[PDB]
UniProtKB/TrEMBL annotation, chains A, B, C, D:
This is D-inositol 3-phosphate glycosyltransferase. Gene3D superfamilies: Glycogen Phosphorylase B (3.40.50.2000). It comes from Streptomyces lincolnensis. The keyword Transferase applies. Keywords: Glycosyltransferase, Transferase.
Amino acid sequence: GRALAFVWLMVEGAQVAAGGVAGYVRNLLDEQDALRDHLAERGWSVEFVLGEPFYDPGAPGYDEERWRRVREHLAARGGRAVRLVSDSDGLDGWGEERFFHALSATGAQLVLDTAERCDAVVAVSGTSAFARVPGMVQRQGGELAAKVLHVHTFGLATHDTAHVPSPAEIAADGDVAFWTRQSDRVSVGYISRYTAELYARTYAIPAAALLPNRSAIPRHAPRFGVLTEERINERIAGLGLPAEGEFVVMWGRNSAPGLDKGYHLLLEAARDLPGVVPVIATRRPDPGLRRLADRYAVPAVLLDDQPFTHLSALLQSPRTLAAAFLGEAEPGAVSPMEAMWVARESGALVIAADTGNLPEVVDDGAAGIVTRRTAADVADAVRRVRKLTADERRRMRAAAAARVRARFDFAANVRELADAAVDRLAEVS
Amino acid sequence: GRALAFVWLMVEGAQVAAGGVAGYVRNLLDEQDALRDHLAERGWSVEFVLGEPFYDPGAPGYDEERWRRVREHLAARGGRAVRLVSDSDGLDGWGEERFFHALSATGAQLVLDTAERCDAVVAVSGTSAFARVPGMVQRQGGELAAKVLHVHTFGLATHDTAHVPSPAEIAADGDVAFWTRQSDRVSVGYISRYTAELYARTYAIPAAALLPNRSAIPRHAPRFGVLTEERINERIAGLGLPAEGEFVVMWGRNSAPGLDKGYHLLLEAARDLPGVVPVIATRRPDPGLRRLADRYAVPAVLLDDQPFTHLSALLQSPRTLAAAFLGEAEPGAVSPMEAMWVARESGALVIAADTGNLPEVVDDGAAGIVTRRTAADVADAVRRVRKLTADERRRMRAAAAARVRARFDFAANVRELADAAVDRLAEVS
Amino acid sequence: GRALAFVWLMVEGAQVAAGGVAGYVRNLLDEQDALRDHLAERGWSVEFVLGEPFYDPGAPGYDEERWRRVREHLAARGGRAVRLVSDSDGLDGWGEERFFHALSATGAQLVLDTAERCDAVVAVSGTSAFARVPGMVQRQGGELAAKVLHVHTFGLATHDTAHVPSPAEIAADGDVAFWTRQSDRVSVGYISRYTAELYARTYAIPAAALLPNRSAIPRHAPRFGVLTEERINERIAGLGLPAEGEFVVMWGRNSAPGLDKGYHLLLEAARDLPGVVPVIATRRPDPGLRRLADRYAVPAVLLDDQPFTHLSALLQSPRTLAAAFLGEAEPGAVSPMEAMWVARESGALVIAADTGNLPEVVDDGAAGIVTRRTAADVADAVRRVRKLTADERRRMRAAAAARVRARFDFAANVRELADAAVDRLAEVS
Amino acid sequence: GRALAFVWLMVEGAQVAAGGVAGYVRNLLDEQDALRDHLAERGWSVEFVLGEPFYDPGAPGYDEERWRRVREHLAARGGRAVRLVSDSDGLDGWGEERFFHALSATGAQLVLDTAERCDAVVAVSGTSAFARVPGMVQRQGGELAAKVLHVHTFGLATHDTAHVPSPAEIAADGDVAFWTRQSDRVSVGYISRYTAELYARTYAIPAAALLPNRSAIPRHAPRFGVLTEERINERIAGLGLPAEGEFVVMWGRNSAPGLDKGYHLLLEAARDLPGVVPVIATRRPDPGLRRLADRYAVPAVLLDDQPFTHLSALLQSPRTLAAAFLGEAEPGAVSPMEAMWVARESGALVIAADTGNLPEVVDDGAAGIVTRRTAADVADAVRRVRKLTADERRRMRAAAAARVRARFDFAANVRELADAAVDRLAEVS
Ligand SMILES: C[C@@H](O)[C@@H](N)[C@H]1O[C@@H](Sc2ncc(C[C@@H](C(=O)O)[N+](C)(C)C)[nH]2)[C@H](O)[C@@H](O)[C@H]1O
Ligand SMILES: C[C@@H](O)[C@@H](N)[C@H]1O[C@@H](Sc2ncc(C[C@@H](C(=O)O)[N+](C)(C)C)[nH]2)[C@H](O)[C@@H](O)[C@H]1O
Ligand SMILES: C[C@@H](O)[C@@H](N)[C@H]1O[C@@H](Sc2ncc(C[C@@H](C(=O)O)[N+](C)(C)C)[nH]2)[C@H](O)[C@@H](O)[C@H]1O
Ligand SMILES: C[C@@H](O)[C@@H](N)[C@H]1O[C@@H](Sc2ncc(C[C@@H](C(=O)O)[N+](C)(C)C)[nH]2)[C@H](O)[C@@H](O)[C@H]1O
Ligand SMILES: Nc1nc2c(ncn2[C@@H]2O[C@H](COP(=O)(O)OP(=O)(O)O)[C@@H](O)[C@H]2O)c(=O)[nH]1
Ligand SMILES: Nc1nc2c(ncn2[C@@H]2O[C@H](COP(=O)(O)OP(=O)(O)O)[C@@H](O)[C@H]2O)c(=O)[nH]1
Ligand SMILES: Nc1nc2c(ncn2[C@@H]2O[C@H](COP(=O)(O)OP(=O)(O)O)[C@@H](O)[C@H]2O)c(=O)[nH]1
Ligand SMILES: Nc1nc2c(ncn2[C@@H]2O[C@H](COP(=O)(O)OP(=O)(O)O)[C@@H](O)[C@H]2O)c(=O)[nH]1
């Protein structure tokens, strides 16, 4: 027989959950059984292995219940949840050389251990933290590395931000570029039209070493379900929301050194936005954003730790003008796809910065409003959105929802990932 | 039920054997079943797990069939032989920062994966390449680190050699010294009288933190069995030895910048001995040793790669006056022990430099001849041995052997480690 | 021709000045000409080199006009100020492996280049980030290294802190310990009794290798002048002090994961101390303390960026009951010294935590109050100050100012460093 | 005023001379004054600063006198020869990560301290050991970094050779590619048409980021002269050359992992091609090459530290019918340039492999023969050289001489780079 294993090496997703990488792992586990079936159809009996850095129960986003949840879920299926030694306190999911080198080593170890017992292995690594893994496996693992195919994904150091990546990130992502060009067993999995281009043109990665791992949402997941107006108003009851004004909603991880989500840009623009109350739902409490909203005399509603139930209500409420997405250069952000789909019938429309994957998601103006990353441009964009006729708005809202169907459907795209990996397994050997 | 695991982390011993670390592993496996028994009596159901850096089939000392034999030994006994990722080509078993950090991460990964399925673990770390394993486990293992006891052995960087150790070596041993002092779950396991005192005052390791892992041999193993006169000459025959002349023998690994066996000392000293032929059997052919043999034009037999069949025959021939161990800072050499035991009845007696553990092996003169590490004192020693009468020689031969029996037996010394280990498992929860 | 250089490798002091290390450099420069004359009496002409990492202008404590004042000061005595490349972005004066390694390389470069132009060097190195410097000069600097004497000072990795020191800090401080025992040209510079003893016993460092660099304050500086009661009040008037209440004062750098100043302990004790007003002049503003004070409902006053003229005023007021010093493990804090000296006439008495150099500073209870590091012990400590008779208070006050004169005069103490260095330089050829 | 500085960071060239890098530094300092005068005519007083690792006096290639000559040469001219801290003992001029990071850090420091006292600096970085100088200066230097143009040359890790480079090499050559794409103050100095092409299709480096540093030989140096056939056999004398009648010379270095020189194909096709008489060489005696020699049946001379005076003559005698250079992919080999120039009246005709910069040297067949790597191809090429036509090999011998004159003049090419660099110092403020 042939027994197949996906090794998912992810910096978050079981113990800790804050962003898209954790959400990718969550989407992964829900689609698992179906993918297993699909692959069985293609001759492979497939097991799932998950590797995530060991975390201190004190880390932002820790949740032991989730951990057990994921561990039990993979175990019943025949897979493992494994916590990998990084060489850190466990109190963060990122670092510099010593954190990357350790986590890569144990990541590569888990890939080879799994390959001893399997017939083939597809090792999906993500983030600069795991980027040295294909080079570590292909350089040293002999007969067992001939069983492994690498797909590396979620971020390569680029020149598309003002903040220059750390030497540690520059080095690890250059390592994986080298190995993608050097080993036919090592591919990049691009997540977006923007990174397939950028990684080809910054790192000289040939077309045959680029596999599709395109960002997507599982549209029919319950958390995206459409809501009646009674439940919408019930759900935002205790959000502290004003009774007057329309909303521009934003949410995500707090911008911190290194990644500039664009929240301050909405706050700057609310100064010249007379009917507009920004609602910024950040993951952790953000004392800094509050300091701005007061320095600008802007009456912002600042939330933290919101469930998606409340965020889904806000986006669906007829009081909500737009959801803004203002990141400096998102490689493959999925929050807009959720907005476009949760607001199928009612609520927000998307305002999307003109950088990273955002223009692709809003179809360059067709399914949403694109804006330059200046306060005046964001203020302009909101006015633009307000000036839309209800005939205009209803076909922009439809066009957005149609796109999430066509391009951003998680089961379609993870099948696109699985299918390419499996097909490539039958040509490298 | 409380399942115990010994995790053995060793730089060689399955894929590759050249020195005493690999002899440790070989002795360990051959003794495993009798340790199951002792530990069974103390209520522990013990299991052996072995971790060795991944090696390229092209490396010095590789052997695919030893590796398959060790792998099966452990697997039949419910344990595991695990090849470990380092950040290397796998062609050598040592390195700089990069090799030490990857191996210590993956060794720590293997300790933690093993605590996941066992009730306690004693992790025996060996050499600077695994010196960081205690802190990697004791900083991030959380509750899994709470069921692990660390014994780090086979070297701490010292100032007893000419070669100043690598900045990587100083870091790794400096790290494990720190953790030995900081955590009641991390101990240095000393391998000799000399090492136990030296590390104690070099690193301020408190006596409670020192554990016995004293070097020793399995005296009643076949390879040390005694030989008929007839059989001795059959083996001596094919090595090309001079028809006349007394023999002084040395064997071990080729000298290299980190380790100075005294091979050069014998050749320099050789001219001052009239009718002595030096026989020097190093692991791999030594072109450099030939050159002082031609400089002093001393008559010498330079063998490479001998089986212990032929080595034993040499150490037992009446044509052999002494075996020489002239290492500069041997921490815990077992070759003298092998010599004092392979020759309880006939043949060589041992010449030991007065540095490292050798004075302890010879009982400071009472079981051998101690010499300074100069070309002159070595000859003085050869001479002294010459002038021993059968009253003094037979007496010196017995003392040495009794000494092995009482201080350097493996079964007793590995149970001292095992007993010390288990005792320390209690007293820490 | 005997030209002598002191090379000062300090993590702050010229571009950036937040804490005691920067206090050191300032004291060094002011004492320079007085010191130069002392060394002129003893046969050397002296020159000062200062080596400080490169710093981005948007950084905590970055004063462009101080860098210029330091640069001109040194160059006018034929000296130099040099900024050193670390492999960092210049925003903070700290890091991990990458930071310590680059800074020590470029620091070791600055010593050797100086040793090319001078006949003798004393190279006084700063924190963990400069600890690799001795082994870097002495392993590779040949004849130039033979002209250098190293004094390493300001804190090693210890087990006196709940925060387990960073692998970078363990590895680096292990390294200089090795080199202290390896070369008579490498010495450790102790700054307190605590430091000395601790090093000797934890790091196994011989008494021959300990050189005095005991922390101290230049008590004739005008910034320690006794303030006249009209002048305290006018200075105090801006701070927002309540009209009632008696003050317990504190000031220093904001606490951070590396280092624990007890600011949150004083707020905790005030929960049991009605009428006591904590006055915590922190370096940057501390939102965390304000949230704490709000939660505990204690009437603390939280200042930031306070000048020492204003701090001196609080310390001298009759309204101020004590100054508190509550650091987890202060190696050689001069801040207690600053209090005991400024309040020689009138004002606070010192409450000192029983760890680090603090008990020695208050002479084990004969010069201030010594307390454990708990909320309740600290609240207890305040009372014992309050119940001291005005009689006993005058006795304490005079003793503390006596002790600064005897034990913590800066000028006497650097002389003691200089003489120890010159002596050691003579001794080793 | 405006003083310009060329800081040359080279792994060898003054203290140690073993390879083409040392040759580049040798030719450089000879043309210093011929560039000092040129650069004045563009308005710059230029100073030359040379940086090199601290070497141990016992290292291969060490010469205390060469280092004293270079130091004084530069000092005479207002420059410096600076020895650079690396994190090794200095016995090798290479390493993995300690070495590259420390060497690049002190290199960047050297550039920056030169940038401080100059108005503009052209920092020419050497191989992977200095690849990180460009980015350590452009991230932390700040103001002084805006006065520096970085030209990194002599090798980027690529995929042409069978050899996979070290992770340390990949990381540093990844780092410099990143800064080269990112900063207009960072350029790669290309040494061949082949290297310029390769760096763009492997590192996505645009030609706009290149500057010429094209590999060249100093034609007018006395060693390159033609001389008498009397001198031919006087310089043949003192060398044990069997006189079969003719030769196919292939001098070079070891054919080992990383640097295959292709001697094997020759040996093979030759011993097979009727009546051809191969000869070879080395730089230090190659015993495995001696092995290959004893292995087949054709003459081979083990040339050991043979001066340039001897080796030129070997190529020029009418016995030599051909010289072959069959490297793996030599990025910018200068020896075929040495062959074509030396045998311009009397000597050999150059045979080149079709890999690396070699087809550029021999003008794609007009000025030499170009042959695929395989030994049946090597036979076919040496077939068209023992067969030599008057209107053919007089016309190609003169093509080869004209090629070195047109493309590979060292005086021409360092001028090209200096002008290119000064030009690009404009266009960046
Ligand atoms: C399915 C999609 O949701 C998925 N492709 C997403 O992956 C992430 S990858 C990432 N996560 C953390 C980091 C480290 C990084 C950071 O925190 O930003 N920093 C620690 C270095 C700053 N990089 C993307 O951020 C996101 O846009 C999106 O592409
Ligand atoms: C059972 C006994 O035989 C056992 N205790 C033995 O352990 C070894 S420990 C060691 N092995 C390799 C190194 C590194 C070292 C090397 O390879 O030599 N170098 C890589 C730095 C050069 N250190 C001792 O050498 C030996 O004496 C003896 O104590
Ligand atoms: C003249 C005297 O003031 C002098 N002896 C003082 O030196 C300093 S040394 C130091 N400063 C910063 C660090 C790094 C450390 C930290 O910030 O705390 N962390 C970055 C690792 C956390 N170490 C002492 O702090 C102080 O007590 C006192 O000894
Ligand atoms: C003037 C010309 O001669 C000049 N451009 C030459 O520069 C050298 S650069 C180089 N030399 C040694 C190494 C490292 C290498 C080694 O030592 O072999 N290894 C340590 C990585 C193995 N890289 C080229 O080799 C050569 O072709 C030629 O371009
Ligand atoms: N409920 C909730 N979900 C969040 C919050 N912040 C982020 N998420 C989820 O995390 C995912 C992050 O998507 P993405 O745009 O890729 O974020 P990024 O990875 O940080 O760039 C989204 O699908 C969100 O649903 C939050 O505050 N509350
Ligand atoms: N058969 C054989 N065994 C060897 C040879 N060289 C070393 N050994 C074995 O390797 C072991 C090394 O023991 P030890 O004295 O500690 O050497 P060390 O570990 O290198 O310091 C000994 O038990 C020897 O039996 C050899 O050439 N032949
Ligand atoms: N003016 C002023 N000086 C400060 C402040 N915080 C710290 N300092 C100075 O920084 C120095 C720190 O001394 P020390 O006790 O060694 O602090 P430490 O290094 O953090 O342990 C003291 O001399 C203070 O004068 C502040 O908020 N204002
Ligand atoms: N005198 C002498 N010079 C040599 C010898 N081998 C190489 N060289 C010099 O070293 C340079 C090597 O050039 P190159 O082809 O680039 O060598 P590479 O850098 O190792 O590829 C040549 O210009 C020679 O002048 C030798 O055996 N003797």
